[PDB]
Prior knowledge:
Oligomer: part of a larger assembly
Structural class: mainly alpha
Order of helices and strands: HH
Strand content: under 5%
Keywords: immune system, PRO-convertase, hydrolase, serine protease, conformational changes, alternative pathway
PDB class: hydrolase
Organism: Homo sapiens (Human)
Subunit structure: Interacts with CFH. Interacts with CR2.
Helix content: 40-55%
Number of strands: 0
Name: complement C3 alpha chain
Amino acid sequence: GLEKRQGALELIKKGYTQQLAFRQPSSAFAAFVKRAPSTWLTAYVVKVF
C-alpha cells in the first residue's frame, strides 16, 4: 500500500515509550512496576529493541 509505513513507525515509537513506563530502577522489566523482575521478559525486550 505504501505511505502507511510512516504510521507504522509511530506505533513502534509509541510502543517503545510505553514499555519504558514498566522499566524498574534495576533496568529490568516486568508485568508491572510492582511485580518481581522477569528474567525472560527482560531478555525478550532486548531481542525486539
